[PDB]
A paper describes a structure:
CISs are macromolecular injection devices with an overall structure that is homologous to the contractile tails of bacteriophages. Their conserved modules include an inner tube, a contractile sheath and a baseplate complex. For firing of the extended apparatus, the baseplate undergoes a conformational change and triggers sheath contraction, which in turn causes the inner tube to be expelled and injected into a target. Here we performed structural and mechanistic studies on a clade Ib CIS gene cluster in the marine bacterium Algoriphagus machipongonensis PR1.
All components of the tube initiator complex possess the conserved β-barrel folds seen in Alg1, whereas Alg7 has one additional C-terminal LysM domain extending out and interacting with the peripheral wedges. The central spike is surrounded by a hexagonal iris-like ring of Alg11-Alg12 heterodimers, forming the baseplate ‘wedges’ with the conserved core bundle and trifurcation units. Six copies of the gp25-like protein (Alg9) attach above Alg11-Alg12, where the C termini from two neighbouring protomers were observed to be slightly different. Domains I–III constitute the gp6-like part and participate in the assembly of the wedges, leaving the gp7-like part (domains IV–VII) exposed on the lateral surface of the baseplate. AlgoCIS exhibits a remarkable structural feature on the baseplate—the formation of an extensive ‘cage’ around the central spike. The Alg11 domain I forms the conserved core bundle together with the domains I and IV in Alg12. The domains IV from the six protomers form a hexagonal cage that surrounds the spike (spike cage).
Residue numbers in the entry:
A (entry chain e): 595 to 643
B (entry chain k), C (entry chain l), D (entry chain m): 2 to 142
E (entry chain Y), F (entry chain d), G (entry chain c), H (entry chain b), I (entry chain a), J (entry chain Z): 3 to 147
The structure:
Amino acid sequence: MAEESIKKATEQFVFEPNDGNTWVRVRAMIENFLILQWRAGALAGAKPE
Amino acid sequence: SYPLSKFHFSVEWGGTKIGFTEVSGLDLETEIIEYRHGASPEYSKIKMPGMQKFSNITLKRGTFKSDNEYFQWYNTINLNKVERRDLTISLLNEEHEPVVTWKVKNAWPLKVQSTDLKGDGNEVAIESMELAHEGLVIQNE
Amino acid sequence: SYPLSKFHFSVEWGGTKIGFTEVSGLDLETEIIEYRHGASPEYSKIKMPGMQKFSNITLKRGTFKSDNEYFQWYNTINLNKVERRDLTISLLNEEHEPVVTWKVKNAWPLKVQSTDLKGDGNEVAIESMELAHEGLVIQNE
Amino acid sequence: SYPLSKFHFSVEWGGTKIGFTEVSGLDLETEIIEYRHGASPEYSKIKMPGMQKFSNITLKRGTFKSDNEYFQWYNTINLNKVERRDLTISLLNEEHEPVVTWKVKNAWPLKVQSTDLKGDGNEVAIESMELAHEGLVIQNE
Amino acid sequence: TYYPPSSFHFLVEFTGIDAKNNDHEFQSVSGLSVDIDTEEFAEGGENRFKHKFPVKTKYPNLVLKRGVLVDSKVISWCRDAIEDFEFKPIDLTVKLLNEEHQPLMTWNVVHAYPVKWSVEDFNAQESKMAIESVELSYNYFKTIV
Amino acid sequence: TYYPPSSFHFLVEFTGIDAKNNDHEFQSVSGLSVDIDTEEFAEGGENRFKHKFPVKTKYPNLVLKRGVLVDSKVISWCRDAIEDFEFKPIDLTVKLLNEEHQPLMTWNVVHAYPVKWSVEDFNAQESKMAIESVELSYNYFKTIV
Amino acid sequence: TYYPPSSFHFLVEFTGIDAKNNDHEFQSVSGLSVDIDTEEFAEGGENRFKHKFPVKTKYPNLVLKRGVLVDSKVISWCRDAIEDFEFKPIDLTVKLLNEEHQPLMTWNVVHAYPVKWSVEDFNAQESKMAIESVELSYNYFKTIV
Amino acid sequence: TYYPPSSFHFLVEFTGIDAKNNDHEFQSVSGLSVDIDTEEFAEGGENRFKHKFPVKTKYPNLVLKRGVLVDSKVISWCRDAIEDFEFKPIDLTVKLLNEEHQPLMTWNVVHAYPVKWSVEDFNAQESKMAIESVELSYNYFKTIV
Amino acid sequence: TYYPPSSFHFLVEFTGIDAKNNDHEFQSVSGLSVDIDTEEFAEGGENRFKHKFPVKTKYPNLVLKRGVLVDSKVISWCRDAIEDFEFKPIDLTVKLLNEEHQPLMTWNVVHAYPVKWSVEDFNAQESKMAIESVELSYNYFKTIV
Amino acid sequence: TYYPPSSFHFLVEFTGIDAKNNDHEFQSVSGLSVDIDTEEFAEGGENRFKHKFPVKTKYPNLVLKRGVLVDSKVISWCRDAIEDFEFKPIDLTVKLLNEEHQPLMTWNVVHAYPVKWSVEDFNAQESKMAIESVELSYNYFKTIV
């Protein structure tokens, strides 16, 4: 489940330039997906780190 | 192949004479609006035209017996009313015909200045006037 | 072994003539940002570059019969629109070829100034223009 | 038993030539902090030293064919980065050796000014530069 | 840093709204800060100070300004919320840039939506540009650096 | 835009009031903006932020200024409401114009009526124009562009 | 108008008080304006705006200033009200004049009486005129033009 | 008047306190004014205005300033009230003078007593005169002219 | 007086604290003033004024400023109160001096103790002296002259 | 002193946070002051003054400013508290320095933790440095000198 959702979220960056201004946007998006899963109780750990 | 000189000219202002000693202030001016958005690669601004301005016009002449034309025009001011006139200024050729013409819309007098008197003042008494207006067009064909 | 003189030059501005009496304002300027933290052993500030500026350019020429190029360019202003031009200024050698070139981006006229008239004005009537622009590059190879 | 003259000197600034027409601005300045307590018998203040300042340095030279050293240094500015240099200014003796030296830390160019052009300008075209810096030491042994 | 960076070179990007280059350029950005609400208590016998306790983390609205743009996608999004109560929150990135135009530091703004839209007054006697202003509410932000 | 438009060229038109050219010319226009009222809530266990919810869309009054005109139709309409409580709401259009004097963008102001009318103080020692000011209440606006 | 009138030429006249030429001349006049008090209501299901309703028409006090005059009839009238609670309301006319010294427009002020009277502070180190100020309450006004 | 009088030539005199020439000279006088408190009422069916009614006449305190005088009789009187609650009200006359040094107009201040006394701050780094200030409460005043 | 004294030459002395010459020198002194609290009453039938009655005499805190002194006795006294709630009130004398450095006039400040102590902000980019400020509460004062 | 010290040379040090030279340098420091809360009481028969009593000692927050630093240890510490409610108080020393760069005087700040963090607004049309600001709450301070 988690892999399919992330895969779809990253389709919007497929034809973007491959540089720092894209790498940072991809990271922010993935982290937002995962923080929600953590709050929901799927992921283990006291804090996101 | 030669430029024009600056001493042969005439002024039509609705008075009885067209000869003047000095004419100045025939200028045009536009304001500038500047802009820069934070993401621009250049660290300077882009410029475009704003609103427009005009300068006041100054006319100088010698004082003559029984000629009170400047005062009489000034004295037409009555609260917010004044006689407005079309002012035509022209640079002349050797046949005394126009070459370069400055056309001025809606002029009226802002101030009238008299001469100063001196015991040893061995010179001509010169009076002057300053005019407000609403626009200038330059013709040179 | 000798320096260049300052009287042989030409200006390309999109008009019909390239001869001018005077050209001025070809400057470049940068702002300075200053800083000092309280624990520093020195009692003065450290400096670094800020944003950039350019000066306006002034051009002067003699008035000629049937030449109204300055007015016509000025008169292309329509609210926020204006005809913008590439301005090229060049210092010439004895073969009348460029030596030093100043390249100016996006110029338009800010103001047009006419001459003053005098009864005893034994001189040439000189008109002038002031231009806004967005950048200057200097070439000397 | 005689003082030094002011016309024989050289400047080392990282460029290809050390000859200049004019050098100015080698100043040092300190601020003053004032104080008076109400019970004092004197009706004036006591003074002590504050923070320190330095002036900008101006350099002037004639324009030469294929020498674009001033522009090239200025053009190293990139947002907050610039090439900084050690500037050494020296007053010379009859053997062309240093007598008085001014040592300047971290200089960079603030502005570059080009010449003005004139139809009757029978003179040398002179360019100039203004430099920011972080400190001056004077040596005279 | 040894020489700290200036503040005049930055980029605003939106996620969930069709991109156009004219919607990434702004005159000014403000509101990237935070605070903690506290409560006080006096303990009998302790006369040197009162105790203070944290309660909540608080963030201000994000404010963006620019010259008026007539075909903006961001404004169409604002209108759907303003006129019909259709709300669909977005994420946003604020980037502070270096001389190679790459980020020095960024801010990740989470779950934002429009609360305000305005245009400054017209004046027949002044030479000025028409300026537009948009304000957004959001839940929190994180930083990457 | 690439070069954003200025704000000094515009037109105000009224629907439901007899037209005169002297009632379409104004010195200044203000009040074309909007905001959303919200409420806050603290959820137990969530210590990172408070929740915020929208409640209502809010608009300010529209304000018009000009030099005093003695035979105005708009003022006759204002007087009927002010003096006799006869209210008959109108619609209005605000137009921002281009160099061909055609609209860049317009605002559609719906169901407006007068709430205020005033003239600035007289002063025997100052050279000034007499200025008139009118304020209108309305329900909402839409834009066309 | 095409050229709107200026505000520095005007006349104040009183009805019910013996006339003197020195009581018709003033330095400044203010307070000729009006407003409408309103109330708000939220209708369930309508989320685009709140409703607004008029309640009352409101007028500010009329304020007159001039240099101090010692034998004024207007001040004697003010004193009877101030010192003895003898109140006898008057009517008043404010006239804005043209170049022939005839009215452009007038204001009819109905049923006025005094609520305030003062003279500005004295200062041994300044060169100034002594200035007097009078404020009147009234019910409403009408205009003629 | 035709040419109104200036305000820089005046005299303050006290009744009930031993006279000294140095207690009649002041830098500034203020507080010679009055106002009327009112109440409002809305009458059902009358929608053009609210009614207003007078209730009370009100006066501000009288304020006097001068350079510091060490042997003042007025200050000894102020101290008895300030330090011991011994109150003994006085009357006072304020005179505005003409070029022959005779009164143009006077104010009769009735039943006054001290409520405040102060001296301005000292500053070792400024060249200034020490200034004293006295404030009095009174019941009413009358004018003679 | 004929020529009133200036305010830049004065002395502050403390009783109950070990003396040092560096604790008698100050940049500025303020707070030497007093006021009387009053109450109002309306008597039925009396419409010319309300009655006013005194209740209490009131004094402000005394404020002293100077450049920072590190070994001050006054500050050690302030710290005992601030840190441990050990309070031991002192008396104080403020002297305004003449050209022979003798008192023109003095103020006797009775039963004072510390309520505040602060030092102004540091700034790496400004050339300024560090300034210290002390505020004292007291019961009353008397004057001698 | 005879010549008091200036305020532009100082050092901020932290205990409990890994040290870096770039976290000890600040543009400005403020908040090193204190006050005492009091209560008032009126005693019947005593009409010269009211009594005042101390209740509590009070301190303001400590505020630090500097240019933006991206790898700061202090900011990482602030983030743990801001984002996760993990609080771990620290001690701090403020040092005012002499010409040998040794302390003239120091302040011992006890048990501090972060309550605020912000960065000033960006502006595309101005040449400015990005400035960061941090505010800390603490219990009390002591001085050493």
